[PDB]
Amino acid sequence: ALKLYVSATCPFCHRVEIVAREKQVSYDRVAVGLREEMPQWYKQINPRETVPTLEVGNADKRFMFESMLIAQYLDNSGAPAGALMGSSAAQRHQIEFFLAQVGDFIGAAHGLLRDPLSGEKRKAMDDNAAYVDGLLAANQTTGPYYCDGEFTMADVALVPFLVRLKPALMYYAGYDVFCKAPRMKALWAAAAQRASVRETSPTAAQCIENYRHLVPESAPMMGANGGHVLYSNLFCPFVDRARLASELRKFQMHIVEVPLHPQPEWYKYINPRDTVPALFTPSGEAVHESQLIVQYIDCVATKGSALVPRGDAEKEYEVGFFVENAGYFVGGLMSWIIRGGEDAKAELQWAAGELEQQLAKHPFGEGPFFGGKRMNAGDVAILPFLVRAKAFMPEFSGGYDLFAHFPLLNGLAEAGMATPEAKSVFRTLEEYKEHIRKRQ
Amino acid sequence: ARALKLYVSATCPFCHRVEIVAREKQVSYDRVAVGLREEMPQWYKQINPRETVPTLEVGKRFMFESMLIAQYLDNSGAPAGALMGSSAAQRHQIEFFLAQVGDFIGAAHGLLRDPLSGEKRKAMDDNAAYVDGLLAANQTTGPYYCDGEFTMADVALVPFLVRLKPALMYYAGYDVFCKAPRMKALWAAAAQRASVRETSPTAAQCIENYRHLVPESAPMMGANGGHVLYSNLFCPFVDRARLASELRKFQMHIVEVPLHPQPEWYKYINPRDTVPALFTPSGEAVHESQLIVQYIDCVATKGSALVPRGDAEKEYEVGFFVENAGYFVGGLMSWIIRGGEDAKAELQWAAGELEQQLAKHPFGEGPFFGGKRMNAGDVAILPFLVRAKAFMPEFSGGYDLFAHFPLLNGLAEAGMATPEAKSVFRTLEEYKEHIRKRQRRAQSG
Amino acid sequence: RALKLYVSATCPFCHRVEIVAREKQVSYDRVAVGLREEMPQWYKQINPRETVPTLEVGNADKRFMFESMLIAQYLDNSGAPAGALMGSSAAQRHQIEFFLAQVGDFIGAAHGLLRDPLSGEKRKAMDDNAAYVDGLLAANQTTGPYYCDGEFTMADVALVPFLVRLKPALMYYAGYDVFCKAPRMKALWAAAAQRASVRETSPTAAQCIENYRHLVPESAPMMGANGGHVLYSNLFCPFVDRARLASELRKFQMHIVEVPLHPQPEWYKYINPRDTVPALFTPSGEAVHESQLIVQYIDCVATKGSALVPRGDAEKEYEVGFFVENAGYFVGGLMSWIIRGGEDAKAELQWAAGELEQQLAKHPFGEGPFFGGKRMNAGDVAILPFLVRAKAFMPEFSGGYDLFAHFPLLNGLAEAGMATPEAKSVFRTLEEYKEHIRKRQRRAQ
């Protein structure tokens, strides 16, 4: 029989598991723990103390080491014998030469994981990804594999790492593994559809977890234990929306406090727009922009009243229109606070009127909120900025108070501020006024 | 009447968005035309105080904004919401992409409002590049934002790509896709979809419908969307295009581009920085003098054919004469601009090749290469025979090529006496002055 | 009319006419004509330009057509559908015609580089024109692979014959990948090369290299190979020793190009961008890089001597694989210890020596002193040269430490290796290697 000793967490093992299926070679799987859980008896079988190892023959049992030599043994043992290593001496040489480069790519990716907010380690990953894309382009005509439509050993050697790095590098370093390597992305995309790859691949959450051991303990997302991570600030009204959504939909997230002006030199790797909020998912995806984060939170959250009224197109319109108009209110309010323009005040008034008039139709029934008795995405969109308006006016506008001219919007503001969700999110009005005084 | 009434202009990419979604989702509506700008009626301004189209009317109540209207239609036709994505993750990607389309549109209209601005051009390069990176970050195979799946992300943008491809070329000499190959593939695929094909304006309407943005002084504005020839009254290469135009009654708006130096803006219209250049009503560029002659001869409907189509051997004949004309031109201009026996011998050889072919009379009787009238060969050479007549013998230290090549002299003479020649060429003395100015400029240091 | 084409099978310009002929399904009588010093006077009579091709049309009224592109268009114009290879519209045709007008520049850059293959400046000029041709394709394409996407047209025909020959020839003569700056041109070639019209008229890779030899300078370093295998080499390099052992053992002929080192010539980076010897170039114009991968290539294509890799036996291929990997670690330790000292490197060397020794003691290839038993295999070849270096280095430069006193089977392998005729024809004397180590330490300071 063939006995393969592996961890389901190990990309080197995955190489061998892919080849086995590609070649229709059967084997008995033996689970073997890694690092502290690696047993002594296994170290006696393989003194290099790594997985995989292959054991051949029942009676006179011998061992084979190293994933690429084992992969090659399996390829040489199923028909056509050796096909995965190429069909000509020229093609085989190009597969061999490629294989002799994959280790630098791996080393660069693991190096980034070990220091994920290093600029210098980020540039090394860029350069190595680009380098590999150049090797693909030099060998390819059409793609998607290294030898075009033929899946070979070149692809097997690399794919297990592409699978795990895509979510892992986004989650731990805000890095897109493919940003400098479009050809490598098309190679990964086609490889991931092959039964041999998809039936042996771990989940995105598993790829993040299985790489946790490389990442430094002080990296900002580590306290999340693989959960949703919200990059945040206690004073930012845009973040407030996300945290309101989260409180309203009982949506657990790990809060990372990012200071602002100055923000840390690394935050630009998490969001290239250098703004909070930013949400990262347990699948290693980035969800950017406060109201987009709110809408995301509302799609996947299980507990609560819906913030977006799915199933009703007209009601979805109302919420969409209020949120758009809330955007125009925000732009007007924030400009007017910071630079004090007259064009700014007029745009604030216009947008308030758009909000107020739709509030006056009560499309979500009676009650003080745009959502009626309860807050919807509309309410979440506007409330933090009404709170900012309450702090700014009339102290810092020589007497002008927007809320004297817009009673329904003042109702929504007072009723929002008085909810439990609001009081677990917002600073005190004085803290907001003080922030304005520091700013000017 | 129907449940849905849509207020639109056929000139409007924002309406095109909603019209695409209607057909994708197979949702029917009554169309109501609304005039734009000065023509917008008050009854419509009362319906939508933002004073833009589209607006949707349901039942009654109104719904504003193309992206909100598009989403209503997506949320009203099975399968409900499908254009906005099949998962939270995919829907987020679409929504983030939709939040960036505004800036692309703004960079595009920025360029149309100031089409020869380097600064607005750089900004369009950067926003196109940026859109392509967004596409690269979400795509694997393409062609759409979500690969094989057409979604709202494509719908938002497609109407602008359709109109900007011909508009940015015509008004700016700018290729909308030069920094955005993925965006090109997305456009190309979308254009073949039923929903987009059947609701698209023609290339000429695209150009017309953006004219209102373009400065009045922009150099191509007097063409009123017709053919535009970037020209100069003294350039023999331009004379070919204009002779061809006269011979085929092909209407073109002439734009006089001064030379030595040419205006800085001209390199935007032809990156080779040369005249002539022809722009078409469909917003395409046609570069190089003899290529332009050829193009004019393909699309023109009046006059005798410059290229003898339907007869392979005679088409060879013209091609051969035109190639040889090319060597004559190289020789002559090189000898006029710099002297040199190398260039003089080139001229003589080329003249000889042309003379030997005229001697075979493949187009029958007459003084022209084309017999009784001028063909593409005659058009290619004549302006250069005219420059030779001005240059020789006064500035060639006595040498007169026409004394040694009589059929080519025949061609020049008969060419110069046609009405087309007399409507195109300057006087022989004007060409002599041109030559004298050039020579003095060359002695300036 | 009845057709006769004068061609050479070596000439890409004739190739163009031959491709169209097949695309259009036009028949012709082929007449071979010699080139250069072989061109006969009777053909020089027919075409005073003294170039191939020429087309003779008709048996009664013999007339001659010149120039591959004019001849190509003539065949396009007399086969149904008439003129389709020049495009289905005025617009597409214009794009085809403009592209045709740039091909000559690309040919010139490519021939200019063959004429001076190790020139940085000719190589840059080739990079830039290859990049320019790719931008033209980008500008006209939506999906590729041809200039007009799925339609094969005259733009492709004009360029394909050159790509076919230049791929092998530029690699063989210049170490240059014709497509490195032109990925779209590559897809265009790879698609055209599957068409019957192109596949059945293309010469072999070897013929492409021979047919271009006449352009390449006599002093270019691969010229003595007369198209054969070329090994860039150095008489003192143990990585090169691997390739030369494989060669000797498999009776594998190669033209040795001695490349000096420390400093290597400034052109060597063009042959191998890693700046290292050995590098192997094949008759088909492929580069084979890295010493042990060269040993493996050699062992695949050779037909004489015993196999170095035991193909057909998975388990035995594993043993050789594992030994070569472990030799890899030994080389790493040895070289690092010699060059820059250090106890880390000495421990690596020892460990690796033990991996090798333990595999030897199982004698997986049976009785005898070599890892391959009675004869050397890929394993012995990977390691012998570095055993020789080990013998030169120790104990003289290692303060008395002699690795071979601790690993007797490895010592046996070394001794028996060194006594082979193959090793005697490859290696320098031990004394020479000792000076080479001394020279390196003196060069260090």
Ligand SMILES: *SC[C@H](NC(=O)CC[C@H](N)C(=O)O)C(=O)NCC(=O)O
């Ligand atoms: S995935 C966990 C590790 N695998 C390897 O490092 C295998 C690398 C070999 N070079 C190969 O076979 O190619 C591993 O087992 N590391 C040690 C541990 O204890 O986890």
Ligand SMILES: *SC[C@H](NC(=O)CC[C@H](N)C(=O)O)C(=O)NCC(=O)O
């Ligand atoms: S409140 C702090 C700032 N946040 C934003 O501007 C978020 C705006 C986005 N449009 C959104 O998430 O909705 C901030 O992070 N400022 C940092 C800076 O340097 O600009």
Ligand SMILES: *SC[C@H](NC(=O)CC[C@H](N)C(=O)O)C(=O)NCC(=O)O
């Ligand atoms: S006569 C003015 C010049 N025109 C051309 O040389 C056109 C040549 C093209 N190859 C063609 O249309 O055939 C000109 O534009 N000179 C400007 C300059 O900077 O060279």
Ligand SMILES: *SC[C@H](NC(=O)CC[C@H](N)C(=O)O)C(=O)NCC(=O)O
């Ligand atoms: S491939 C051999 C040469 N052919 C050409 O250079 C043709 C050039 C024409 N302008 C064309 O048809 O495109 C050739 O005949 N060179 C001279 C020789 O004796 O080989």
Ligand SMILES: *SC[C@H](NC(=O)CC[C@H](N)C(=O)O)C(=O)NCC(=O)O
């Ligand atoms: S012995 C001369 C050196 N050869 C190599 O380093 C080849 C090593 C490769 N891995 C191989 O071919 O096996 C050499 O050329 N050194 C020069 C340098 O730039 O490093």
Ligand SMILES: N[C@@H](CCC(=O)N[C@@H](CS)C(=O)NCC(=O)O)C(=O)O
């Ligand atoms: N944001 C609006 C924009 C609509 C718009 O700008 N429509 C234009 C037509 S191109 C318009 O009605 N312009 C005013 C006018 O034509 O007078 C939407 O997306 O629906």
